[PDB]
Protein backbone atom coordinates (compact mmCIF):
# COMPACT_ATOMS: atom_id res chain seq x y z
CA UNK A 1 0.00 0.00 0.00
CA UNK A 2 0.98 3.62 -0.50
CA UNK A 3 2.77 4.38 2.73
CA UNK A 4 2.79 8.07 1.89
CA UNK A 5 -1.00 8.04 1.93
CA UNK A 6 -1.40 5.80 4.91
CA UNK A 7 0.83 7.97 7.08
CA UNK A 8 0.19 11.28 5.32
CA UNK A 9 3.74 12.02 4.44
CA UNK A 10 4.01 15.45 2.86
CA UNK A 11 6.82 17.64 1.76
CA UNK A 12 7.12 21.37 2.24
CA UNK A 13 9.80 23.63 0.82
CA UNK A 14 10.64 26.98 -0.72
CA UNK A 15 12.78 27.52 -3.76
CA UNK A 16 14.14 30.55 -5.55
CA UNK A 17 15.86 30.99 -8.86
CA UNK A 18 19.59 30.28 -8.84
CA UNK A 19 22.04 33.11 -9.54
CA UNK A 20 24.73 32.52 -12.14
CA UNK A 21 28.40 31.89 -11.54
CA UNK A 22 31.56 32.34 -13.61
CA UNK A 23 33.40 28.98 -13.55
CA UNK A 24 32.13 25.52 -12.70
CA UNK A 25 30.82 22.47 -14.44
CA UNK A 26 27.69 22.75 -12.34
CA UNK A 27 26.16 26.12 -13.27
CA UNK A 28 22.81 25.16 -14.90
CA UNK A 29 21.64 28.41 -16.50
CA UNK A 30 19.08 26.57 -18.65
CA UNK A 31 17.76 24.12 -16.02
CA UNK A 32 14.25 22.95 -16.93
CA UNK A 33 13.38 23.84 -13.32
CA UNK A 34 13.49 27.58 -12.83
CA UNK A 35 12.85 27.35 -9.01
CA UNK A 36 15.42 24.97 -7.54
CA UNK A 37 17.42 27.12 -5.14
CA UNK A 38 17.18 25.56 -1.71
CA UNK A 39 20.10 26.78 0.34
CA UNK A 40 23.32 28.77 0.58
CA UNK A 41 26.11 28.33 3.16
CA UNK A 42 23.91 26.48 5.58
CA UNK A 43 21.23 29.14 5.26
CA UNK A 44 18.25 30.09 3.08
CA UNK A 45 19.47 31.83 -0.12
CA UNK A 46 17.28 34.86 0.64
CA UNK A 47 16.61 36.88 3.79
CA UNK A 48 13.94 36.33 6.48
CA UNK A 49 10.76 36.11 4.36
CA UNK A 50 7.85 36.75 6.75
CA UNK A 51 5.14 35.93 4.27
CA UNK A 52 6.54 32.43 3.59
CA UNK A 53 7.59 31.89 7.26
CA UNK A 54 3.98 32.62 8.27
CA UNK A 55 2.72 30.21 5.58
CA UNK A 56 5.12 27.44 6.54
CA UNK A 57 4.11 27.84 10.18
CA UNK A 58 0.39 27.85 9.49
CA UNK A 59 0.57 24.77 7.17
CA UNK A 60 2.90 22.72 9.41
CA UNK A 61 1.05 23.65 12.54
CA UNK A 62 -2.63 23.17 11.50
CA UNK A 63 -4.54 20.12 12.82
CA UNK A 64 -8.20 19.18 12.43
CA UNK A 65 -9.38 17.08 15.40
CA UNK A 66 -12.41 16.05 13.35
CA UNK A 67 -10.60 14.53 10.39
CA UNK A 68 -8.27 12.66 12.71
CA UNK A 69 -10.51 9.65 13.31
CA UNK A 70 -10.70 8.82 9.64
CA UNK A 71 -6.91 8.91 9.66
CA UNK A 72 -6.81 6.86 12.83
CA UNK A 73 -9.05 4.19 11.33
CA UNK A 74 -6.95 4.10 8.17
CA UNK A 75 -3.78 3.43 10.12
CA UNK A 76 -5.37 1.02 12.60
CA UNK A 77 -6.60 -0.81 9.54
CA UNK A 78 -3.21 -0.90 7.74
CA UNK A 79 -1.50 -1.97 10.99
CA UNK A 80 -3.60 -5.18 11.37
CA UNK A 81 -3.06 -6.38 7.80
CA UNK A 82 0.63 -6.52 8.86
CA UNK A 83 -2.71 16.53 22.04
CA UNK A 84 -3.01 16.51 18.24
CA UNK A 85 0.06 17.84 16.38
CA UNK A 86 1.78 17.26 13.07
CA UNK A 87 5.24 15.80 12.86
CA UNK A 88 8.08 17.78 11.24
CA UNK A 89 11.14 15.89 9.99
CA UNK A 90 14.41 17.57 9.21
CA UNK A 91 17.92 16.53 8.29
CA UNK A 92 20.78 17.18 10.68
CA UNK A 93 22.14 20.01 8.57
CA UNK A 94 18.81 21.73 8.41
CA UNK A 95 18.34 21.13 12.13
CA UNK A 96 21.72 22.70 12.89
CA UNK A 97 20.93 25.56 10.52
CA UNK A 98 17.97 26.63 12.65
CA UNK A 99 18.74 29.27 15.33
CA UNK A 100 18.26 28.06 18.93
CA UNK A 101 15.49 30.59 19.60
CA UNK A 102 13.31 28.35 17.40
CA UNK A 103 14.21 24.76 18.19
CA UNK A 104 12.33 22.81 18.82
CA UNK A 105 9.59 24.03 16.48
CA UNK A 106 6.62 24.72 18.75
CA UNK A 107 3.19 23.11 18.41
CA UNK A 108 4.86 20.37 16.46
CA UNK A 109 6.52 17.02 17.21
CA UNK A 110 10.19 17.45 16.12
CA UNK A 111 12.14 14.72 14.44
CA UNK A 112 15.72 14.83 13.31
CA UNK A 113 17.30 12.41 10.88
CA UNK A 114 20.92 11.69 11.74
CA UNK A 115 23.45 8.92 12.14
CA UNK A 116 25.79 10.86 14.42
CA UNK A 117 23.67 12.81 16.87
CA UNK A 118 22.64 11.32 20.17
CA UNK A 119 20.37 12.18 23.08
CA UNK A 120 23.24 13.37 25.27
CA UNK A 121 24.22 15.83 22.53
CA UNK A 122 20.81 17.29 21.62
CA UNK A 123 19.09 18.89 24.64
CA UNK A 124 15.91 19.83 22.84
CA UNK A 125 12.77 17.74 22.89
CA UNK A 126 13.03 15.92 19.53
CA UNK A 127 13.02 12.35 18.31
CA UNK A 128 16.27 11.31 16.72
CA UNK A 129 16.10 8.67 13.99
CA UNK A 130 18.82 7.06 11.97
CA UNK A 131 16.90 6.19 8.80
CA UNK A 132 13.62 6.62 6.94
CA UNK A 133 12.98 3.00 8.01
CA UNK A 134 13.12 4.09 11.61
CA UNK A 135 10.92 7.03 10.67
CA UNK A 136 8.25 4.61 9.51
CA UNK A 137 8.63 2.60 12.72
CA UNK A 138 8.12 5.80 14.76
CA UNK A 139 5.09 6.93 12.72
CA UNK A 140 3.66 3.42 13.04
CA UNK A 141 3.53 3.85 16.85
CA UNK A 142 2.97 7.55 17.26
CA UNK A 143 -0.21 9.65 17.32
CA UNK A 144 -0.02 12.52 14.87
CA UNK A 145 -2.08 14.33 12.26
CA UNK A 146 0.09 15.02 9.20
CA UNK A 147 3.82 14.37 8.78
CA UNK A 148 5.78 17.15 7.11
CA UNK A 149 9.25 16.70 5.56
CA UNK A 150 10.84 20.11 5.90
CA UNK A 151 14.39 19.59 4.61
CA UNK A 152 17.03 19.52 3.70
CA UNK A 153 18.05 18.29 0.22
CA UNK A 154 19.18 14.78 1.17
CA UNK A 155 15.95 14.11 3.10
CA UNK A 156 13.83 15.31 0.17
CA UNK A 157 15.73 13.05 -2.22
CA UNK A 158 15.47 9.87 -0.24
CA UNK A 159 11.76 10.42 0.38
CA UNK A 160 10.94 11.24 -3.21
CA UNK A 161 13.07 8.27 -4.34
CA UNK A 162 11.09 5.91 -2.19
CA UNK A 163 7.79 7.42 -3.33
CA UNK A 164 7.04 8.36 0.28
CA UNK A 165 5.72 11.81 -0.65
CA UNK A 166 1.94 12.17 -0.97
CA UNK A 167 1.97 15.96 -1.40
CA UNK A 168 4.46 18.73 -1.96
CA UNK A 169 3.87 22.31 -0.71
CA UNK A 170 6.22 24.27 -2.92
CA UNK A 171 6.76 28.03 -2.35
CA UNK A 172 8.25 29.82 -5.33
CA UNK A 173 10.59 32.62 -4.34
CA UNK A 174 10.55 35.00 -7.27
CA UNK A 175 14.14 36.14 -6.91
CA UNK A 176 17.59 34.91 -7.88
CA UNK A 177 20.25 34.25 -5.26
CA UNK A 178 23.49 32.34 -4.85
CA UNK A 179 22.84 28.67 -3.92
CA UNK A 180 24.97 25.61 -3.08
CA UNK A 181 21.98 23.35 -2.39
CA UNK A 182 19.15 22.55 -4.81
CA UNK A 183 15.85 20.71 -4.73
CA UNK A 184 16.34 17.12 -5.88
CA UNK A 185 14.86 16.12 -9.20
CA UNK A 186 11.94 13.75 -9.34
CA UNK A 187 9.58 12.22 -11.84
CA UNK A 188 7.05 15.03 -12.27
CA UNK A 189 4.60 12.76 -14.10
CA UNK A 190 3.56 11.14 -10.84
CA UNK A 191 2.31 14.47 -9.53
CA UNK A 192 -0.12 17.17 -10.57
CA UNK A 193 -0.65 20.74 -9.39
CA UNK A 194 -3.75 20.93 -7.26
CA UNK A 195 -3.35 24.45 -5.73
CA UNK A 196 -1.85 27.58 -7.27
CA UNK A 197 -2.23 30.57 -4.94
CA UNK A 198 -2.41 34.25 -5.95
CA UNK A 199 0.84 36.25 -5.94
CA UNK A 200 2.35 37.84 -2.80
CA UNK A 201 4.78 40.71 -2.22
CA UNK A 202 7.25 40.43 0.67
CA UNK A 203 9.28 43.66 0.78
CA UNK A 204 9.34 43.79 -3.01
CA UNK A 205 10.15 40.13 -3.82
CA UNK A 206 7.15 38.17 -5.08
CA UNK A 207 6.30 34.60 -4.21
CA UNK A 208 3.49 32.07 -4.67
CA UNK A 209 2.30 28.82 -3.12
CA UNK A 210 1.84 25.72 -5.26
CA UNK A 211 0.61 22.36 -4.07
CA UNK A 212 1.27 19.06 -5.89
CA UNK A 213 -0.53 15.81 -5.12
CA UNK A 214 0.40 12.25 -5.99
CA UNK A 215 -1.36 10.75 -8.99
N1 LIG B 1 14.29 26.30 1.02
C2 LIG B 1 13.83 25.31 1.85
O3 LIG B 1 12.59 25.09 1.87
C4 LIG B 1 14.79 24.55 2.69
C5 LIG B 1 16.22 24.85 2.61
N6 LIG B 1 17.08 24.09 3.45
C7 LIG B 1 18.52 24.40 3.29
O8 LIG B 1 19.14 23.17 2.75
C9 LIG B 1 20.53 23.09 3.13
C10 LIG B 1 20.66 21.73 3.93
O11 LIG B 1 20.36 20.57 3.03
P12 LIG B 1 21.39 19.35 3.02
O13 LIG B 1 22.79 19.80 3.13
O14 LIG B 1 20.94 18.40 1.97
O15 LIG B 1 21.04 18.70 4.46
P16 LIG B 1 19.93 17.92 5.23
O17 LIG B 1 19.22 18.92 6.03
O18 LIG B 1 19.27 16.93 4.46
O19 LIG B 1 20.85 17.12 6.29
C20 LIG B 1 21.86 16.24 5.79
C21 LIG B 1 22.12 15.39 6.97
O22 LIG B 1 20.82 14.86 7.39
C23 LIG B 1 21.11 13.47 7.75
N24 LIG B 1 20.43 12.49 6.94
C25 LIG B 1 19.99 12.62 5.61
N26 LIG B 1 19.43 11.52 5.22
C27 LIG B 1 19.47 10.65 6.27
C28 LIG B 1 19.04 9.32 6.46
N29 LIG B 1 18.43 8.66 5.47
N30 LIG B 1 19.23 8.73 7.66
C31 LIG B 1 19.85 9.41 8.66
N32 LIG B 1 20.31 10.67 8.57
C33 LIG B 1 20.08 11.23 7.33
C34 LIG B 1 22.60 13.26 7.86
O35 LIG B 1 23.09 13.47 9.15
P36 LIG B 1 24.36 12.85 9.74
O37 LIG B 1 25.53 13.33 8.98
O38 LIG B 1 24.45 13.31 11.19
O39 LIG B 1 24.13 11.42 9.64
C40 LIG B 1 23.01 14.21 6.83
O41 LIG B 1 24.44 14.43 6.63
C42 LIG B 1 20.71 24.30 4.11
O43 LIG B 1 21.40 25.38 3.47
C44 LIG B 1 19.31 24.66 4.65
O45 LIG B 1 19.24 26.01 4.98
C46 LIG B 1 16.59 23.09 4.33
C47 LIG B 1 15.23 22.82 4.38
C48 LIG B 1 14.37 23.54 3.57
C1 LIG C 1 10.25 29.45 6.60
C2 LIG C 1 11.14 28.84 5.53
C3 LIG C 1 10.58 27.57 4.87
N4 LIG C 1 9.56 27.84 3.92
C5 LIG C 1 9.00 26.79 3.28
N6 LIG C 1 7.98 27.07 2.36
N7 LIG C 1 9.29 25.47 3.43
C8 LIG C 1 10.30 25.19 4.38
N9 LIG C 1 10.59 23.91 4.54
C10 LIG C 1 11.01 26.22 5.16
C11 LIG C 1 12.07 25.78 6.16
C12 LIG C 1 13.43 25.70 5.79
C13 LIG C 1 14.44 25.28 6.69
C14 LIG C 1 14.05 24.92 8.01
C15 LIG C 1 12.72 24.99 8.41
C16 LIG C 1 11.71 25.41 7.50
Ligand number nearest CA of 116 is 1
Q: Would you say the C-alpha torsion 100, 103, 105, 111 has a positive or negative sign?
A: positive
Ligand number nearest CA of 155 is 1
Q: Which of 56, 15, 51 is nearest to 177 (CA)?
A: 15
Which residue segments constitute the domains of the chain, with CATH numbers given? 1-215 (3.40.430.10)
| d(CA 94, ligand 1 centre) in Å | 5
Q: Which of 173, 171, 145 is nearest to 63 (CA)?
A: 145
Ligand 1 atom with the smallest distance to the CA of 180 is 43
- Structure method: X-ray
For this experimental structure, what is the resolution in angstroms? 2.2
Q: Which of 38, 44, 86 to mutate to test the pocket of ligand 2 (most atoms within 8 A of CB)?
A: 44
- The answer to whether residues 7 and 147 touch, using CB atoms and an 8 Å cutoff, is yes
Q: Which of 9, 24, 37, 12 is nearest to 174 (CA)?
A: 37
- The answer to whether residues 117 and 134 touch, using CB atoms and an 8 Å cutoff, is no
Q: Residues 201-206: contacts with CB within 8 Å, 24+ apart?
A: 201/51, 202/49, 202/50, 202/51, 202/52, 205/46, 205/49, 205/173, 205/174, 205/175, 206/174, 206/175
For the chain, the three-class secondary structure string (H helix, E strand, C coil) is: CCHHHHCCEEEEEEEEEECCCCCCCCCCCCCCCCEEEEEECCECCCCCCHHHHHHHHHHHHCCCHHHHHHHHHHHHHHHHHCCCCEEEEEEHHHHHHCCHHHCCCCCEEEEEECCCCCCCCCCCCCEEECCHHHHHHHHHCCCCCCEEECCCHHHHHHHHHCCCCCEEEEEEEEEEECCCEECCCCCHHHEEEEEECCCEEECCEEEEEEEEEEC
Checking the chain for breaks where C and the next N are over 2.5 Å apart, the residues before them are 82
Amino acid sequence: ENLSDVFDIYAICACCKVAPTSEGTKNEPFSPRTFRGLGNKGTLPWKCNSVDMKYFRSVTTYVDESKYEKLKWKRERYLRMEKLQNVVVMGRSNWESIPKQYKPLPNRINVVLSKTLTKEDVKEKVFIIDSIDDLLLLLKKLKYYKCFIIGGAQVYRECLSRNLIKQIYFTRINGAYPCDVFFPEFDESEFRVTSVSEVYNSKGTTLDFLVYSKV
